[PDB]
Amino acid sequence: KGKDIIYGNECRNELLKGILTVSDVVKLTLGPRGRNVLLEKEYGSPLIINDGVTIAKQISLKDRKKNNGVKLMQESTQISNDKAGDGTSSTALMTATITKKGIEQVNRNHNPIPIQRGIQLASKMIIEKIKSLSTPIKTYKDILNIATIASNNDVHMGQIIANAYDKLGKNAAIILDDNADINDKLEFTEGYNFDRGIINPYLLYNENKDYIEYSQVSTLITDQNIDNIQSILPILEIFAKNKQPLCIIADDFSNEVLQTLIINKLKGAIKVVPIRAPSFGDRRKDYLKDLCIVTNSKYISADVGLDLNNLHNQMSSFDNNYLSLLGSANTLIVKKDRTSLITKEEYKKEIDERINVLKKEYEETTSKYDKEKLNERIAALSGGIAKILIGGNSETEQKERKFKYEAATNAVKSAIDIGYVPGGGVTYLEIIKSNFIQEIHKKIEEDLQISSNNDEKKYLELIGNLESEMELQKMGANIVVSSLDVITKQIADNAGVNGDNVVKIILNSKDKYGFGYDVNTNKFVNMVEKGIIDSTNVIISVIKNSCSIASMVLTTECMMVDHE
Amino acid sequence: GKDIIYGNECRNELLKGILTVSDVVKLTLGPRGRNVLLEKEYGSPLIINDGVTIAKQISLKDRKKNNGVKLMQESTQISNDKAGDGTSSTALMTATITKKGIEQVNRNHNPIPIQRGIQLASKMIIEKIKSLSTPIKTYKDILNIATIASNNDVHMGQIIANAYDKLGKNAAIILDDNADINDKLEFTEGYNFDRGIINPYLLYNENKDYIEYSQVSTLITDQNIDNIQSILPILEIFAKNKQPLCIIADDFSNEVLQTLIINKLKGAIKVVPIRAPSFGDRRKDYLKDLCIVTNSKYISADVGLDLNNLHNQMSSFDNNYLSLLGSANTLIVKKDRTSLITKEEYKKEIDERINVLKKEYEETTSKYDKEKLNERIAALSGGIAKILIGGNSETEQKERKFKYEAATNAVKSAIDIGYVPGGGVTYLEIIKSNFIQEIHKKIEEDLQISSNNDEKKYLELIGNLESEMELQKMGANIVVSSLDVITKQIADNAGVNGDNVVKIILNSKDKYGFGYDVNTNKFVNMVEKGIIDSTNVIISVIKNSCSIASMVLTTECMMVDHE
Ligand SMILES: Nc1ncnc2c1ncn2[C@@H]1O[C@H](COP(=O)(O)OP(=O)(O)OP(=O)(O)O)[C@@H](O)[C@H]1O
Ligand SMILES: Nc1ncnc2c1ncn2[C@@H]1O[C@H](COP(=O)(O)OP(=O)(O)OP(=O)(O)O)[C@@H](O)[C@H]1O
Ligand SMILES: [Mg+2]
Ligand SMILES: [Mg+2]
Structure with missing residues (x-):
């Protein structure tokens, strides 16, 4: 028995390497037109899957040090616990982008506490903005659209959820049960x-x-x-x-x-x-x-x-x-x-x-x-x-569809509770094109003004530079803001189109709120019109989880692996 | 087969183990301490901020250096699961004093006078801290000491405060495990x-x-x-x-x-x-x-x-x-x-x-x-009073149990004549009031009442008198120079210049209890904002650190069964 201790930049860099590994393997499946990933099973059969959760639950690096980041992201997103809801695939990419941008700055003789403060404040302000940019769910088509989108564009299960909500109320308790057939039947009791x-x-x-x-x-x-x-x-x-x-x-x-x-x-x-x-x-x-x-x-x-x-x-x-x-x-x-x-x-x-x-x-x-x-x-x-008897072509496909149905139903519940925002990553792009970054900047400036001049003593000026504190706080805010175009860009890129240019089009055209690029029909349309919408809770949770993980990694200053 | 190693080499390896423990624990000092990642072979990594929990898992593969780690794990009762409050600060002070002393001993110096100076400084500082204590009178004092000694946990702090208010100034409290996550309080x-x-x-x-x-x-x-x-x-x-x-x-x-x-x-x-x-x-x-x-x-x-x-x-x-x-x-x-x-x-x-x-x-x-x-x-x-402690896991129950025991013991030591400003300002007071000169005067009198009593050359040929006095005061200086590490480490972990905070507290105006609150980045009064510690905790921290340093300085041999 013996432990191996590693501190500072080395620890953060190895954790970042694990996080980046998870993101590099998951971001390829973002969107309905995501690429395929081949996983070899020692049992004798290889599986080609396009679902990010299934692939992320099997990523494990031999480097016991780098593997820590992988496990960290597998547990923070509830992937290892088999309770990872919708949006985890996007959460991995955003978390890796924000964490990398922050670590690259911290390791360069910078202060991590103000950057963490800025990241957390930006997360809270962006969550409030997203809440203010949400719309309530009224028509049945909205429920069907959110269910189909949250179901990786599975019209069958989406229709099942929609019918389970139509023949019942907007507070219907739906139970998921295993079935011996290959079709997902729906019953009412x-x-x-x-x-x-x-x-x-x-x-x-x-x-x-x-x-x-x-x-x-x-x-x-x-x-x-x-x-x-x-x-x-x-x-x-x-x-x-x-x-x-x-x-x-x-x-x-x-x-x-x-x-x-x-x-x-x-x-x-x-x-x-x-x-x-x-x-x-x-x-x-x-x-x-x-x-x-x-x-x-x-x-x-x-x-x-x-x-x-x-x-x-x-x-x-x-x-x-x-x-x-x-x-x-x-x-x-x-x-x-x-x-x-x-x-x-x-x-x-x-x-x-x-x-x-x-x-x-x-x-x-x-x-x-x-x-x-x-x-x-x-x-x-x-x-x-409502009783949903889910089935599949194998014993594992049943559990996969069960988890899919659970995540979809949770998304629909969060959508009947709080509103819904246009999908395709346009919600993340709105806060970038509308200059919300200036709002968070003003907020940090006011929070520091009520503390610098108010405290009529220069005791706080020598224990830290005021301008440096403002610059680092806004630095964390800029890091959180600049990592919002990765979702839509990756989704468009996986489809075979220039992602950065698609982001440039969405940001430079001042269309209504929800103007995006549909990859299923490779055309620029309105998201709320064609039914490409996500639940506000999913996006809020994605940004909150990414910012929290980034701040936690920035605050981490030590690692201990039992092997030397 | 055994591996024997003597002198400076043995002390240096023991010091390396001690320094490893301190370097890994000091990061969690204060309420704004940093995070530490611990990998369990079970498959799940844990991000902890408690110094005791992390210290109970540090172990080096170097069988020789690991001895220092084990030494500090047992001296602070960490391996025995009986580590009270202040162990996190005890580790830092012990490592600082031990390194300062070993660096001097290894240079062909005498460890006995340094040990004497360390012990005398410990006793004098303990007496000074006792003379710097205030009685506990109001209930808010009990609540504040309980909350501070409980790693700033308002819930458990309030539980202990209510257990002592609704009961006598003895409060026989029993700590039992619970199946819920909300630590409930009962009376029987x-x-x-x-x-x-x-x-x-x-x-x-x-x-x-x-x-x-x-x-x-x-x-x-x-x-x-x-x-x-x-x-x-x-x-x-x-x-x-x-x-x-x-x-x-x-x-x-x-x-x-x-x-x-x-x-x-x-x-x-x-x-x-x-x-x-x-x-x-x-x-x-x-x-x-x-x-x-x-x-x-x-x-x-x-x-x-x-x-x-x-x-x-x-x-x-x-x-x-x-x-x-x-x-x-x-x-x-x-x-x-x-x-x-x-x-x-x-x-x-x-x-x-x-x-x-x-x-x-x-x-x-x-x-x-x-x-x-x-x-x-x-x-x-x-x-x-029966405190049913619970948690979100089976191990969290025992962790919170130990936390509650340490907090209650701190409150018990505080209900006696014990109360001091928190934030490490108590360690800074002996530095700001030039107490180092007091310990110097004590060693000078103890040596003068022994130097002019022999009236012969018997003691001058067996050792230099001025060198012996200088080494004794050297040990005293070593103990004194390692008192600003607590407040400095807390401020550093909070994201502000720690050394500058210590300089501000020492170079402040005429105040006594004036410290720096890291929770609201402001220089305030510790006794006013409720940031207070029990005198027994500080006394034990200084006594344990000085005792461990002197014991390590006296050690001259190590034996490990391996090669
Ligand atoms: N037809 C579509 N056209 C454009 N964008 C879409 C379309 N369908 C979904 N999206 C966008 O893709 C994102 C979903 O990507 P994906 O389903 O690959 O992973 P995820 O939902 O983030 O997580 P999980 O894989 O756990 O479901 C949503 O945010 C949505 O806005
Ligand atoms: N809000 C605060 N601001 C400044 N200093 C504080 C504050 N709260 C506590 N302290 C100081 O921090 C010290 C406690 O540090 P910490 O709780 O991290 O470890 P410890 O109590 O020494 O040991 P243990 O980790 O076993 O409890 C106390 O001596 C106290 O003076
Ligand atoms: Mg999906
Ligand atoms: Mg404490």
């Missing part, structure tokens, strides 16, 4: 979806699937906060002996009643999902009642006499059966913030009847607060869940 | 006396330096366990039960101090032998209180239950040996101040007992009895 998820993520340290999937679970819906573990202990023991999945929907969960026995034992012999009731006030009662009618769980609450702290005294109410007090559901899917449950085929009529009653109450009350509360309740009760 | 009724681990040998298995047992069975007595055959049935019963056992006796005779043997040789029986809390008759009363907090049948000859011959006539005990003991929720045995979390069942009994004691407080005039009874009631009541 009635269910309930609220706005609560997995409170303590440690519940996933057994199964590492980022979600919870339990089939035919028994529900225990209450209204109080489960504090005394000896209050629900008999039900817990019963389900621990039968080994059946259990879901508990309480209001809160005392500190010690969720760690001493729930999380540590589920990794032993018990299936429990502790979700909290979704509420903003007393409305919790109504939502819990709806959940108890959807699954027939016998609403537990002190208001209805059934107190969760003494269920042994009233043992002659629920017919002495601790299980007749519980409910049932087909499938339970608990995400980070949106629990979903598929209603059983038996209660279908009951809930339907309840829905009718609620409708009868909707046209019988005024003041707009009861009508809005009832409207939200009816919309939640009569909701649904 | 309990009993805390002034006894600890009478024999640290019980820690040769667990490297946690403390004892934490959940749902233990208590056996509280009043006599001295002299015959092991008096508790042998209970030990045999517990040999079958994999349940924790705690025995609170009065003296625990020499040979009955074998339970620790069965507990370590095979962990078959788990026994914690704590001693009586008081020195005298009050121990009986305290033991009775302990027997009321836990359902323990107080053993003593005055109440008839004698621990010797429990099979005598005219007794009640049915030889059962089991219901005679008590129970508790959790038992925490530290080096001192043992803690027991009261059970949710005996609570009312204790309340009643407390009330009875109060009835005796307003019924007696003897002030000594009212004081003893008041302390007893205060001990019965009270609470214990």
Whole structure:
């Protein structure tokens, strides 16, 4: 055992070499007309792929030092974790460009702290500008276009997402399931979806699937906060002996009643999902009642006499059966913030009847607060869940398409939340052609003016040059700005056209916001008209990740590899 | 086969290892420290900013140079996972002083006078820092020391501050691992006396330096366990039960101090032998209180239950040996101040007992009895703070656990007479107030009271007097010249000229506590902006650095088993 330590410029240069390797291999696949990359498998078959994520997940350099940069970019972009969303391919290129431009300056006797400050400020200001340059999603064609673009121009899966959003609402919970066929079929099933998820993520340290999937679970819906573990202990023991999945929907969960026995034992012999009731006030009662009618769980609450702290005294109410007090559901899917449950085929009529009653109450009350509360309740009760059965020609193609669908759906969700901006890298070019660099310059100048003259003391002038601080801050800003034409230029270059000249045309022609070059038809058109649009969150995340990684590498001053 | 190396070569290689540790740790000094990349063979690289976490992984392939690294990893308790606050600064000061001293020793100089000067400078500086401390009075002071000693973590700092405000000026705090990511804070009724681990040998298995047992069975007595055959049935019963056992006796005779043997040789029986809390008759009363907090049948000859011959006539005990003991929720045995979390069942009994004691407080005039009874009631009541620490990973839990332990220990040392301006200005004060002349005067007097006392040429032929004095003051100068490294390194890591910051602080106007805040790039008052450190941390930093430097200077040989 022995470590090898390396500091300063050498460390930054090796990390930069790894980053540049990842970018040099990924930028070739940017755009729909990206080039192909051949990967030889020792299993005996070579694969020619054009997807940047698949190629990036296999890049690894023999140089243990340079490989650090590769691993760093594989983890910062969530590529190694198999959760890398859309835009990571562009993030690699932008990150490498910004990091190289910054490191070349830092290694030349410059100060990295002011450059990092300028990079971070430029990132924040550019994110605000991109937010101010976004447009909301209104028509269905917008959803179809964003889904197809975020799906590497896959019309089939794009249409699937579009139809999943049309037959459902703009808050539809879509579940991705594996299929045995070669086509991606779409189904719909009635269910309930609220706005609560997995409170303590440690519940996933057994199964590492980022979600919870339990089939035919028994529900225990209450209204109080489960504090005394000896209050629900008999039900817990019963389900621990039968080994059946259990879901508990309480209001809160005392500190010690969720760690001493729930999380540590589920990794032993018990299936429990502790979700909290979704509420903003007393409305919790109504939502819990709806959940108890959807699954027939016998609403537990002190208001209805059934107190969760003494269920042994009233043992002659629920017919002495601790299980007749519980409910049932087909499938339970608990995400980070949106629990979903598929209603059983038996209660279908009951809930339907309840829905009718609620409708009868909707046209019988005024003041707009009861009508809005009832409207939200009816919309939640009569909701649904879209099931996308994804398939492929191989076992690995299924997982690839699964990741593709996950990234596309996440992009569509971020697009229904925040707006959308024209694709093709024109959004990055707008901040360059509209002179936003002068705005960030003015911002750094004001931030330094409120600190230099304001502090009436020359104590800060000798510990550092003021003009040098301004020059370095604006230097970092210039570095972040000058590395925005790489996306569109690389996309056009991979298609076989002069990328730099395309950028020059887009920057010199003052057309509306969104004027770009379509590589599928090699023609200069309007992006928002032909449907080439991206979600604002994707672009914002791309620039934020690139700037954060660049600043982190600039701040890094030491490397340790266990080999000497 | 061994490889032996002496003198300057050995010292130079040890210094190279020490310098490696310092060069890798000083980059994280201060809140604006730089990042360090550590590659794990698992496949994931980690960007860390904590000096302790990075120092625990530095290891050189050079078996000889690696010795210095290991030396500093053990002297600062880093390898033992007991490194408190200030170790990051201790590394830098130790390396600077050690290099300055070795460079002088290697030039045919004498290391003994330099070592003497270093030790004297350390003692004098410690006394000066003690005289430069201020008492802690307001709660904001506790919050500030906790936040600063916690690597500027407002959450954990506030947790410690609230644990000390909502509790007494002792705050028995227990640190436990949690499954959540939000470090929660709880309070639980309990009993805390002034006894600890009478024999640290019980820690040769667990490297946690403390004892934490959940749902233990208590056996509280009043006599001295002299015959092991008096508790042998209970030990045999517990040999079958994999349940924790705690025995609170009065003296625990020499040979009955074998339970620790069965507990370590095979962990078959788990026994914690704590001693009586008081020195005298009050121990009986305290033991009775302990027997009321836990359902323990107080053993003593005055109440008839004698621990010797429990099979005598005219007794009640049915030889059962089991219901005679008590129970508790959790038992925490530290080096001192043992803690027991009261059970949710005996609570009312204790309340009643407390009330009875109060009835005796307003019924007696003897002030000594009212004081003893008041302390007893205060001990019965009270609470214990439980800090459930968590993280985003399994290793982050232990990392935050060590962080919380170091921060709480710093606050404990600060509640005593300890409070000093942060930012390394305390090290700069001994430089700005010409204290070097004070240490010079001390060595001059210590040598004058010895030079004119012999009145013969016996000491002048065995060594130059002026050279000896010059070397002693040389060691003192070495210790003094290495005090601006803390503030300079912090300012340098922040992106500003560190040396110029030190010159400004020393060449400032007439102020005392005036420093440079790197978080808001401004020269302000440390005591005003809450940037304060515990005097014990600074004292330990200087003492450890000087001790390690002197030890390295005295070393004259190295042996590595290789070639
Ligand atoms: N038909 C098109 N014409 C012009 N530009 C396009 C077209 N389709 C997509 N783009 C642009 O190409 C970019 C997407 O490139 P690509 O899909 O190769 O990688 P990515 O989306 O950045 O990351 P990932 O590979 O993970 O999806 C988008 O920013 C979009 O603006
Ligand atoms: N905001 C601040 N501005 C200037 N100096 C500070 C500030 N906060 C803390 N310091 C100084 O930095 C020192 C603490 O540095 P740091 O926390 O990096 O390592 P450490 O506390 O010496 O050891 P460890 O890393 O084990 O905690 C303290 O002595 C304190 O005086
Ligand atoms: Mg794509
Ligand atoms: Mg600290």
